[PDB]
Design a binder for this molecule. Structure first.
Ligand SMILES: *[C@@H]1O[C@H](CO)[C@@H](O[C@@H]2O[C@H](CO)[C@@H](O[C@@H]3O[C@H](CO[C@H]4O[C@H](CO)[C@@H](O)[C@H](O[C@H]5O[C@H](CO)[C@@H](O)[C@H](O)[C@@H]5O)[C@@H]4O)[C@@H](O)[C@H](O[C@H]4O[C@H](CO)[C@@H](O)[C@H](O)[C@@H]4O[C@H]4O[C@H](CO)[C@@H](O)[C@H](O)[C@@H]4O)[C@@H]3O)[C@H](O)[C@H]2NC(C)=O)[C@H](O)[C@H]1NC(C)=O
Ligand SMILES: *[C@@H]1O[C@H](CO[C@@H]2O[C@@H](C)[C@@H](O)[C@@H](O)[C@@H]2O)[C@@H](O[C@@H]2O[C@H](CO)[C@@H](O[C@@H]3O[C@H](CO)[C@@H](O)[C@H](O)[C@@H]3O)[C@H](O)[C@H]2NC(C)=O)[C@H](O)[C@H]1NC(C)=O
Ligand SMILES: *[C@@H]1O[C@H](CO)[C@@H](O[C@@H]2O[C@H](CO)[C@@H](O[C@@H]3O[C@H](CO)[C@@H](O)[C@H](O)[C@@H]3O)[C@H](O)[C@H]2NC(C)=O)[C@H](O)[C@H]1NC(C)=O
Ligand SMILES: *[C@@H]1O[C@H](CO)[C@@H](O[C@@H]2O[C@H](CO)[C@@H](O[C@@H]3O[C@H](CO)[C@@H](O)[C@H](O)[C@@H]3O)[C@H](O)[C@H]2NC(C)=O)[C@H](O)[C@H]1NC(C)=O
Ligand SMILES: *[C@@H]1O[C@H](CO)[C@@H](O[C@@H]2O[C@H](CO)[C@@H](O[C@@H]3O[C@H](CO)[C@@H](O)[C@H](O)[C@@H]3O)[C@H](O)[C@H]2NC(C)=O)[C@H](O)[C@H]1NC(C)=O
Ligand SMILES: *[C@@H]1O[C@H](CO)[C@@H](O[C@@H]2O[C@H](CO)[C@@H](O)[C@H](O)[C@H]2NC(C)=O)[C@H](O)[C@H]1NC(C)=O
Ligand SMILES: *[C@@H]1O[C@H](CO[C@@H]2O[C@@H](C)[C@@H](O)[C@@H](O)[C@@H]2O)[C@@H](O)[C@H](O)[C@H]1NC(C)=O
Lengths: 44, 363, 49, 50
């Protein structure tokens, strides 16, 4: 499960898939390293 | 001619608007007139404004401890004890109009700008040497071009107060009439503001009394959460105590004065509105909010709950009364209607919003 | 993803749809609103042969 | 909107409030709830299609 076609096959559980439209998730960033964002109201 | 006079009320060219307050009554329409073209030295009482050489304005008891006014052509506002004793330019076009109005400890002047002053006084007595006004009057401006041209002013009856889009004639049962714009009647929330949808919410939209106060005039008033609010009701009044009272204004400069909003709790503690970033001075300081660049609505309700622009910034103990001190407007776009105060009671209402503003309501 | 957006919502401090999900929030100090979007979006793969 | 008897309907909120072991139990409540709500939607569309 590395190839996007193989990723789709591993999304289901089957070595072959029927012709059709299969839901898919847009390829997110491979390296997460996600910055942290924090927003709250000003305090006294 | 009043083309120049109403152009001092800075209004956009293609906009038709409604004027309210102690304006010049006029020389020929209605009864009005009383234009003292000659130096007859008229003597009338109960006057709340004058328009246009000698002018003397004083309290009816003529208190030596009260400040009287004397304008001659120099100006002296003095008791025996002088506050202002100086000279002021007095040059104008023959068609230019200069007036002074006093009410609710406030003074408005029309010397090339809509000047506003706070001055505790009682100025019904007047002698002069050109007309008087005792009661508020109303005009319409069919402005079509900037400057003097295209203003096309006319006088009108009180019904024109319903022409302004930010005020309405309250129905006898307290319901807001259908078709109201709800231009700045944000739905109240302590949390996220709905963008688009419909909510059945308990909101203070059951209005008991609406005060359409002209923009050029401030307001110094005492409202109580146990008596019906005073003032001229715009529509059908409801003799009910306010559960909430909702202040709809144009610009933030009305509130920036210290002590503009004073909240009195059942304990008797006073919260004074302070800005520098708005706090409530307790007499300690309680932080209210970093005030948004455009304050359009302040709704204050008993149960200790103050909202700015429809957000739950601060919650307090059960209030019982409020005192105001609103300070006119910026004198750069006024009297395009009125800034209003609505006494309201909470009600379960179906509210539809798109964008962020109410568009239609159903009790 | 937080992107500065070009609307001018005057009321509230942050905004949610009728389903209670955060859509945008306002920077109170500046009055600018920022929209919040998912990091990834759904897609449909056409799988033939 | 519905938190199906979980701590909250925001799944990232659950993982912040709870430790990973108990969070898995809590998020599984809404996974079951959303899956059943998703199955109900499908079951009624297939009825429309028929
Ligand atoms: C942001 O947060 C703030 C703070 O959290 C919220 O402020 C809240 O605002 C709501 C109104 O929107 C307040 O609800 C009101 O509470 C009143 C308190 O009354 C007290 O005395 C009565 C005596 O009867 C007690 O019953 C109350 O105790 C509770 O009683 C029952 C028990 O379940 C509850 O259901 C009540 O809600 C009370 O909480 C209190 O001790 C309350 O009187 C008032 O009730 C009126 O409205 C309801 C409909 O909601 C009517 O059914 C009821 O009959 C009342 O209407 C009558 O009111 C007077 C009473 O004499 C009559 O003379 C009238 O003619 C009329 O018939 C209402 O429930 C709430 O208290 C308040 N919270 C705090 C902490 O102060 C903000 O809402 C929130 N922002 C938003 C957008 O929600
Ligand atoms: C408020 O002002 C608008 C704008 O027009 C301005 O004010 C008028 C009183 C005139 O002084 C105009 O010279 C000035 O630009 C008024 O709209 C215009 O009204 C006039 C008459 O009041 C219209 O002229 C007539 O209109 C009728 C019906 O439309 C025609 O059948 C006639 O043939 C003739 O054209 C004019 O069309 C109309 N529109 C424009 C662009 O001028 C408006 O009436 C006035 N009053 C109110 C209450 O809004
Ligand atoms: C309602 O609002 C008015 C307008 O703000 C309040 O009057 C203001 O009162 C303050 C307090 O004294 C005045 O400040 C003083 O100004 C003089 C200059 O005249 C200065 O020498 C003093 O050191 C002090 O700073 C302020 O000038 C005055 N406003 C005006 C326009 O004169 C009034 O007190 C408020 N009433 C209530 C009940 O809150
Ligand atoms: C008070 O209400 C008025 C309208 O009811 C608004 O203020 C005024 O709004 C007009 C319309 O924008 C401004 O006039 C024009 O602005 C445009 C902006 O592009 C400019 O190109 C024109 O030359 C003309 O100036 C007017 O300046 C403005 N008045 C001000 C800023 O004092 C507004 O809703 C309220 N005013 C404030 C200050 O919140
Ligand atoms: C929300 O809006 C506010 C208001 O604009 C933002 O605050 C602003 O933050 C920047 C960066 O911190 C400030 O820039 C200044 O640069 C000088 C140059 O060296 C530096 O000396 C200052 O210390 C400061 O960094 C800017 O002045 C400030 N605006 C203010 C104070 O009005 C804020 O970043 C925005 N975003 C949030 C709160 O997430
Ligand atoms: C809190 O404010 C109230 C006003 O509601 C003050 O009580 C009034 O103060 C004025 C001051 O000139 C008196 O003339 C009134 O007689 C007082 N009573 C009423 C019912 O208006 C009160 O003194 C203030 N207290 C504090 C600690 O600031
Ligand atoms: C508060 O009001 C109580 C009820 O009396 C009426 O209340 C409202 C509905 C108005 O109609 C008001 O004019 C009436 O007096 C009184 O019993 C109570 O004494 C009042 N308390 C205070 C401190 O004013």
């Amino acid at each position: 499960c590395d190839d996007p076609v193989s990723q789709l096959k591993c999304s289901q559980v089957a070595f072959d898939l029927d012709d059709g439209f299969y839901p898919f998730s847009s390829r997110n960033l491979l390296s997460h390293e996600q910055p942290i964002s924090f927003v709250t109201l000003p305090s006294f | 001619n009043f083309r120049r006079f109403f152009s001092k009320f800075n209004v956009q060219a293609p906009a038709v608007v409604v004027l309210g307050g102690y304006l010049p009554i006029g020389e020929n329409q209605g009864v009005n007139s009383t234009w003292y073209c000659a130096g007859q030295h008229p003597t009338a009482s109960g006057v709340h404004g004058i328009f246009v050489f000698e002018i003397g304005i004083s309290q009816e008891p003529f208190d030596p401890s009260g400040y009287q006014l004397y304008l001659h052509k120099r100006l002296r506002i003095c008791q025996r004890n002088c506050l202002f004793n100086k000279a002021i330019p007095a040059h104008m076009s023959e068609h230019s109009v200069v007036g002074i109005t006093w009410d609710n400890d406030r003074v408005t002047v029309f010397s090339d700008k809509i000047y506003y002053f706070y001055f505790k006084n009682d100025w019904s007595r007047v002698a002069t040497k050109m007309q008087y006004v005792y009661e508020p009057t109303y005009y319409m401006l069919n402005v079509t071009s900037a400057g003097e041209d295209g203003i096309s002013y006319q006088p009108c009856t009180a019904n024109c107060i319903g022409y302004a889009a930010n005020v309405f004639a309250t129905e006898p049962n307290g319901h807001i009439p259908e078709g109201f714009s709800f231009n700045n009647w944000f739905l109240l929330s302590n949390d996220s503001t709905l963008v688009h949808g419909k909510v059945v919410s308990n909101q203070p939209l059951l209005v008991n009394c609406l005060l359409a106060i002209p923009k050029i005039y401030g307001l110094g008033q005492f409202f109580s959460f146990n008596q019906t609010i005073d003032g001229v009701c715009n529509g059908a009044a409801v003799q009910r105590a306010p559960e909430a009272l909702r202040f709809n204004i144009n610009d933030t400069s009305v509130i920036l004065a210290e002590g503009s909003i004073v909240l009195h709790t059942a304990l008797g503690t006073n919260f004074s509105f302070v800005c520098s970033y708005c706090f409530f001075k307790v007499d300690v300081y309680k932080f209210l909010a970093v005030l948004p660049p455009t304050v359009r609505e302040i709704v204050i309700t008993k149960y200790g709950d103050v909202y700015v622009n429809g957000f739950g910034y601060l919650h307090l103990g059960l209030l019982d009364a409020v005192t105001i001190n609103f300070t006119g407007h910026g004198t750069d776009d006024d009297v395009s209607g009125f800034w209003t105060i609505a006494s309201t009671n909470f009600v379960d209402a179906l509210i539809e919003v798109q964008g962020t503003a109410i568009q239609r309501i159903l009790y | 993803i937080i992107t500065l957006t070009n609307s001018s919502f005057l009321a509230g401090v942050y905004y949610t749809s009728d389903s209670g999900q955060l859509l945008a929030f306002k920077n109170v100090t500046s009055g600018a609103v920022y929209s919040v979007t998912p990091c990834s979006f759904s897609e449909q793969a056409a799988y033939v042969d | 909107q519905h938190n199906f008897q979980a701590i909250s309907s925001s799944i990232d909120d659950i993982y912040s409030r709870l430790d990973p072991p108990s969070a898995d139990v809590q998020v599984d409540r809404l996974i079951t709830g959303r899956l059943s709500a998703l199955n109900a939607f499908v079951a009624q569309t297939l009825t429309k299609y028929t």
